Amino acid sequence: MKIEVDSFSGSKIYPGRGTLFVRGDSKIFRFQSSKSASLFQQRKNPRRISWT
């Protein structure tokens, strides 16, 4: 197995937890929860989110 890391908050993604997103440019994104996913969908900046 392999623990994955959130492409937004950096949270640890354990097997099954969270969602996975494939963008058009084939780049893969991993979100541990809907909140990190939702912020990415709203096109925020993780550099500016105070807890990421």
Binding site: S11, Y14, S33
Partner: peptide, 24 residues
């Protein structure tokens, strides 16, 4: 078994152990 999930069921838990939490 390879691994058993012990993250919190009370929310979007992201740690398996308090030691892991405090280390992160």
């Amino acid at each position: 078994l390879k691994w058993i999930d012990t993250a919190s069921r009370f929310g979007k838990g992201r740690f398996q152990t308090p030691a892991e939490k405090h280390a992160f």
